[PDB]
């Protein structure tokens, strides 16, 4: 039994030296014997590898005292409707030196904002994990043609995450003490949040008594939506997957049952607007 979380997407045929492999599964077969691994004299470590590690398959189902649940119930989400921000991400595929994972390309929100990122991945090396630009391409097909020009209009992730925090803070500071990301088929949105979200115990802001919604890697400080200028991470966001509420077909077909003012323009922000809109009609209309 294995998982796809942290799958090695490199094209290297062999596994790793016992000192460099993060896990027993990832050690090369040549070192495996008698239920464990052996060091083989004369077989050296590899000092030049770059192995892309997939961030698909996170499971946020822990129950740790003092840490809030990220995923919330429909009833809790309804009480926090003012915090709702629809969120959708269109990805590009790892290519060339790696294959088998999706990287965030266009991040869209129900505010109408689309942010484009440079295709970036988590590349294991002999010394660390290098968060870096990786070779990528949009998926093939006429429905993914619009992503082609976005491959050369991306911003580095350190800039993108600052923009997400600024956008959420400007939108929500006078509406809610939190954010509830409204999602449809959450897997890739949760992978994308690895790039701009941090979690921990509930905290208060550095300049007031409001709960912290943002974190800064510059000073290791916390801020609410009012005091987050320059902050780079969203801290303890909440989220809900609308698809888990009994719907059977795709997002557009379910959205269109209740609404006709949101024509599908086939962009991450339009999917984000449609997801929030569908959740609003389901919980509040009639």
């Amino acid at each position: 039994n294995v998982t796809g979380l942290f799958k090695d997407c490199s094209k290297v045929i062999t596994g790793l030296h016992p000192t460099q492999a993060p896990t027993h599964l990832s050690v090369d077969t040549k070192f495996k014997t008698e239920g464990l691994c052996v060091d083989i004299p004369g077989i050296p470590k590899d000092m030049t590898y770059r192995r892309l590690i997939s961030m698909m398959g996170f499971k946020m189902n822990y129950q740790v005292n003092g840490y809030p649940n990220m995923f919330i119930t429909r009833e809790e989400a309804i009480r926090h409707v003012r915090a709702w921000i629809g969120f959708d991400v269109e990805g590009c595929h790892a290519t060339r030196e790696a294959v088998g994972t999706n990287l965030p390309l266009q991040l869209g929100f129900s505010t109408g904002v689309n942010l484009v990122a440079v295709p970036t991945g988590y590349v294991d090396t002999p010394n660390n994990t290098d968060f870096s630009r990786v070779s990528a391409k949009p998926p093939p097909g006429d429905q993914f043609k619009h992503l082609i020009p976005l491959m050369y209009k991306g911003l580095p992730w350190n800039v993108v995450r600052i923009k997400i925090v600024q956008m959420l803070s400007d939108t929500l500071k006078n509406l809610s003490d939190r954010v509830v990301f409204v999602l449809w088929a959450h897997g890739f949105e949760l992978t994308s949040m690895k790039y701009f979200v941090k979690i921990g115990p509930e905290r208060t802001c550095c300049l007031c008594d409001r709960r912290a919604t943002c974190f800064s890697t510059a000073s290791d400080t916390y801020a609410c939506w009012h005091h987050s200028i320059g902050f780079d991470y969203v801290y303890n966001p909440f989220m809900i997957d609308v698809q888990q509420w009994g719907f059977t077909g795709n997002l557009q077909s379910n959205h269109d049952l209740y609404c006709q003012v949101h024509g599908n323009a086939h962009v991450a922000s339009c999917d984000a607007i449609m997801t929030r809109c569908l959740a609003v009609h389901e919980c509040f209309v009639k």
């Binding site: 796809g4 896990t23 027993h24 949040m193 290791d220």
Partner: protein, 131 residues
Amino acid sequence: AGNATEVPANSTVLSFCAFAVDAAKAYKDYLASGGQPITNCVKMLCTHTGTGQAITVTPEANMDQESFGGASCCLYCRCHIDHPNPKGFCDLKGKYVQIPTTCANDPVGFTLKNTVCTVCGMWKGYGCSCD
């Protein structure tokens, strides 16, 4: 396409620590709330006649220890996150780490909580002959 590195028993703990502001504190808290330690480490077959030093080029477990591949006992390597060093590089990856047998059920937690003596090369409280 690709080759799996992990098993389902570690999915929850690794996801929790990969998102945390303070990964070492999250791992400690996860254990205190009843979670299972990270498994699937690289445990070595050795002769248990080694020097007993904490971090070595080849397995050096003595009769009170077990030898593991270094990257597999490092929370930052396991979660593919930043190392809390100034240059962001790892001191365990590329080495073998000797862990006291009594602590061998949780090698990642052991390395997070303990310190190596720079004079004798052995773990403080688990072999250090300095004081």
